[PDB]
PDB file of all heavy atoms in Angstrom:
ATOM      1  N   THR A 160     -55.874 -22.869  -1.336  1.00 14.16           N
ATOM      2  CA  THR A 160     -55.378 -22.135  -2.485  1.00 14.16           C
ATOM      3  C   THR A 160     -53.999 -22.624  -2.881  1.00 14.16           C
ATOM      4  O   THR A 160     -53.288 -23.257  -2.101  1.00 14.16           O
ATOM      5  CB  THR A 160     -55.338 -20.626  -2.193  1.00 14.16           C
ATOM      6  OG1 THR A 160     -54.268 -20.360  -1.270  1.00 14.16           O
ATOM      7  CG2 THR A 160     -56.645 -20.165  -1.590  1.00 14.16           C
ATOM      8  N   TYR A 161     -53.627 -22.313  -4.117  1.00 11.77           N
ATOM      9  CA  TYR A 161     -52.336 -22.664  -4.665  1.00 11.77           C
ATOM     10  C   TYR A 161     -51.736 -21.465  -5.386  1.00 11.77           C
ATOM     11  O   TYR A 161     -52.456 -20.582  -5.854  1.00 11.77           O
ATOM     12  CB  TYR A 161     -52.423 -23.854  -5.631  1.00 11.77           C
ATOM     13  CG  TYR A 161     -53.265 -23.615  -6.858  1.00 11.77           C
ATOM     14  CD1 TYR A 161     -52.683 -23.316  -8.073  1.00 11.77           C
ATOM     15  CD2 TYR A 161     -54.651 -23.709  -6.797  1.00 11.77           C
ATOM     16  CE1 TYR A 161     -53.458 -23.098  -9.195  1.00 11.77           C
ATOM     17  CE2 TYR A 161     -55.428 -23.491  -7.919  1.00 11.77           C
ATOM     18  CZ  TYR A 161     -54.825 -23.189  -9.117  1.00 11.77           C
ATOM     19  OH  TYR A 161     -55.597 -22.973 -10.233  1.00 11.77           O
ATOM     20  N   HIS A 162     -50.410 -21.441  -5.435  1.00 12.36           N
ATOM     21  CA  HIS A 162     -49.676 -20.308  -5.980  1.00 12.36           C
ATOM     22  C   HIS A 162     -49.687 -20.335  -7.501  1.00 12.36           C
ATOM     23  O   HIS A 162     -49.311 -21.332  -8.116  1.00 12.36           O
ATOM     24  CB  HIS A 162     -48.235 -20.333  -5.451  1.00 12.36           C
ATOM     25  CG  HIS A 162     -47.367 -19.228  -5.960  1.00 12.36           C
ATOM     26  ND1 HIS A 162     -46.013 -19.174  -5.705  1.00 12.36           N
ATOM     27  CD2 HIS A 162     -47.667 -18.109  -6.666  1.00 12.36           C
ATOM     28  CE1 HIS A 162     -45.507 -18.083  -6.255  1.00 12.36           C
ATOM     29  NE2 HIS A 162     -46.495 -17.421  -6.843  1.00 12.36           N
ATOM     30  N   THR A 163     -50.121 -19.228  -8.099  1.00 11.06           N
ATOM     31  CA  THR A 163     -50.175 -19.070  -9.546  1.00 11.06           C
ATOM     32  C   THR A 163     -50.394 -17.589  -9.853  1.00 11.06           C
ATOM     33  O   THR A 163     -50.353 -16.740  -8.955  1.00 11.06           O
ATOM     34  CB  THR A 163     -51.286 -19.927 -10.167  1.00 11.06           C
ATOM     35  OG1 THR A 163     -51.447 -19.570 -11.544  1.00 11.06           O
ATOM     36  CG2 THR A 163     -52.592 -19.680  -9.436  1.00 11.06           C
ATOM     37  N   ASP A 164     -50.598 -17.282 -11.122  1.00 17.10           N
ATOM     38  CA  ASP A 164     -50.888 -15.912 -11.545  1.00 17.10           C
ATOM     39  C   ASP A 164     -52.312 -15.525 -11.186  1.00 17.10           C
ATOM     40  O   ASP A 164     -53.200 -16.374 -11.078  1.00 17.10           O
ATOM     41  CB  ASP A 164     -50.659 -15.751 -13.043  1.00 17.10           C
ATOM     42  CG  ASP A 164     -51.824 -16.271 -13.863  1.00 17.10           C
ATOM     43  OD1 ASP A 164     -51.902 -17.507 -14.061  1.00 17.10           O
ATOM     44  OD2 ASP A 164     -52.662 -15.460 -14.301  1.00 17.10           O
ATOM     45  N   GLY A 165     -52.520 -14.229 -10.998  1.00 18.36           N
ATOM     46  CA  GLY A 165     -53.823 -13.731 -10.594  1.00 18.36           C
ATOM     47  C   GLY A 165     -54.398 -12.679 -11.524  1.00 18.36           C
ATOM     48  O   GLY A 165     -54.976 -11.693 -11.066  1.00 18.36           O
ATOM     49  N   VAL A 166     -54.244 -12.884 -12.831  1.00 20.50           N
ATOM     50  CA  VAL A 166     -54.700 -11.892 -13.804  1.00 20.50           C
ATOM     51  C   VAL A 166     -56.201 -11.690 -13.701  1.00 20.50           C
ATOM     52  O   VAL A 166     -56.693 -10.558 -13.678  1.00 20.50           O
ATOM     53  CB  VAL A 166     -54.278 -12.310 -15.220  1.00 20.50           C
ATOM     54  CG1 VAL A 166     -55.193 -11.665 -16.255  1.00 20.50           C
ATOM     55  CG2 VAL A 166     -52.841 -11.925 -15.478  1.00 20.50           C
ATOM     56  N   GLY A 167     -56.956 -12.785 -13.610  1.00 20.37           N
ATOM     57  CA  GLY A 167     -58.402 -12.708 -13.584  1.00 20.37           C
ATOM     58  C   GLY A 167     -59.046 -12.464 -12.234  1.00 20.37           C
ATOM     59  O   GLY A 167     -60.243 -12.175 -12.173  1.00 20.37           O
ATOM     60  N   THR A 168     -58.282 -12.571 -11.153  1.00 24.72           N
ATOM     61  CA  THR A 168     -58.860 -12.438  -9.819  1.00 24.72           C
ATOM     62  C   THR A 168     -59.142 -10.968  -9.497  1.00 24.72           C
ATOM     63  O   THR A 168     -58.745 -10.054 -10.221  1.00 24.72           O
ATOM     64  CB  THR A 168     -57.935 -13.045  -8.766  1.00 24.72           C
ATOM     65  OG1 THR A 168     -56.998 -12.051  -8.323  1.00 24.72           O
ATOM     66  CG2 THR A 168     -57.189 -14.230  -9.338  1.00 24.72           C
ATOM     67  N   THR A 169     -59.849 -10.762  -8.377  1.00 23.03           N
ATOM     68  CA  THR A 169     -60.242  -9.411  -7.991  1.00 23.03           C
ATOM     69  C   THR A 169     -59.038  -8.578  -7.583  1.00 23.03           C
ATOM     70  O   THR A 169     -58.952  -7.389  -7.926  1.00 23.03           O
ATOM     71  CB  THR A 169     -61.246  -9.474  -6.845  1.00 23.03           C
ATOM     72  OG1 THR A 169     -60.549  -9.552  -5.594  1.00 23.03           O
ATOM     73  CG2 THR A 169     -62.140 -10.697  -6.985  1.00 23.03           C
ATOM     74  N   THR A 170     -58.080  -9.173  -6.859  1.00 24.10           N
ATOM     75  CA  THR A 170     -56.915  -8.459  -6.334  1.00 24.10           C
ATOM     76  C   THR A 170     -55.655  -9.141  -6.846  1.00 24.10           C
ATOM     77  O   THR A 170     -55.093 -10.020  -6.171  1.00 24.10           O
ATOM     78  CB  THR A 170     -56.933  -8.426  -4.816  1.00 24.10           C
ATOM     79  OG1 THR A 170     -57.047  -9.756  -4.306  1.00 24.10           O
ATOM     80  CG2 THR A 170     -58.107  -7.593  -4.311  1.00 24.10           C
ATOM     81  N   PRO A 171     -55.178  -8.772  -8.035  1.00 22.30           N
ATOM     82  CA  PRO A 171     -53.945  -9.368  -8.554  1.00 22.30           C
ATOM     83  C   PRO A 171     -52.737  -8.906  -7.760  1.00 22.30           C
ATOM     84  O   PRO A 171     -52.476  -7.715  -7.654  1.00 22.30           O
ATOM     85  CB  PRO A 171     -53.882  -8.869 -10.015  1.00 22.30           C
ATOM     86  CG  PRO A 171     -55.227  -8.244 -10.282  1.00 22.30           C
ATOM     87  CD  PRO A 171     -55.750  -7.791  -8.965  1.00 22.30           C
ATOM     88  N   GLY A 172     -52.009  -9.867  -7.201  1.00 23.61           N
ATOM     89  CA  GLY A 172     -50.810  -9.562  -6.451  1.00 23.61           C
ATOM     90  C   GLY A 172     -49.573  -9.344  -7.296  1.00 23.61           C
ATOM     91  O   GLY A 172     -48.499  -9.068  -6.745  1.00 23.61           O
ATOM     92  N   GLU A 173     -49.689  -9.452  -8.613  1.00 25.94           N
ATOM     93  CA  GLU A 173     -48.539  -9.312  -9.486  1.00 25.94           C
ATOM     94  C   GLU A 173     -48.009  -7.889  -9.455  1.00 25.94           C
ATOM     95  O   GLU A 173     -48.764  -6.925  -9.427  1.00 25.94           O
ATOM     96  CB  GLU A 173     -48.905  -9.708 -10.913  1.00 25.94           C
ATOM     97  CG  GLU A 173     -48.780 -11.194 -11.194  1.00 25.94           C
ATOM     98  CD  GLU A 173     -49.638 -12.027 -10.265  1.00 25.94           C
ATOM     99  OE1 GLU A 173     -50.875 -12.004 -10.431  1.00 25.94           O
ATOM    100  OE2 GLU A 173     -49.079 -12.698  -9.382  1.00 25.94           O
ATOM    101  N   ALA A 174     -46.678  -7.767  -9.470  1.00 24.50           N
ATOM    102  CA  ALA A 174     -46.055  -6.444  -9.481  1.00 24.50           C
ATOM    103  C   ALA A 174     -46.300  -5.752 -10.815  1.00 24.50           C
ATOM    104  O   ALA A 174     -46.369  -6.382 -11.873  1.00 24.50           O
ATOM    105  CB  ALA A 174     -44.551  -6.570  -9.222  1.00 24.50           C
ATOM    106  N   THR A 175     -46.439  -4.420 -10.744  1.00 23.68           N
ATOM    107  CA  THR A 175     -46.680  -3.640 -11.945  1.00 23.68           C
ATOM    108  C   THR A 175     -45.406  -3.514 -12.771  1.00 23.68           C
ATOM    109  O   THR A 175     -44.309  -3.871 -12.332  1.00 23.68           O
ATOM    110  CB  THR A 175     -47.198  -2.254 -11.583  1.00 23.68           C
ATOM    111  OG1 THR A 175     -46.108  -1.369 -11.353  1.00 23.68           O
ATOM    112  CG2 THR A 175     -48.049  -2.324 -10.316  1.00 23.68           C
ATOM    113  N   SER A 176     -45.559  -3.006 -13.995  1.00 22.49           N
ATOM    114  CA  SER A 176     -44.392  -2.765 -14.833  1.00 22.49           C
ATOM    115  C   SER A 176     -43.563  -1.601 -14.345  1.00 22.49           C
ATOM    116  O   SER A 176     -42.368  -1.525 -14.674  1.00 22.49           O
ATOM    117  CB  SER A 176     -44.837  -2.511 -16.275  1.00 22.49           C
ATOM    118  OG  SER A 176     -45.040  -1.129 -16.508  1.00 22.49           O
TER     119      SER A 176
END
Side-chain angles (χ1 to χ4, degrees):
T160 71
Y161 62 100
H162 179 187
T163 171
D164 80 280
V166 156
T168 88
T169 86
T170 55
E173 274 58 71
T175 87
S176 91

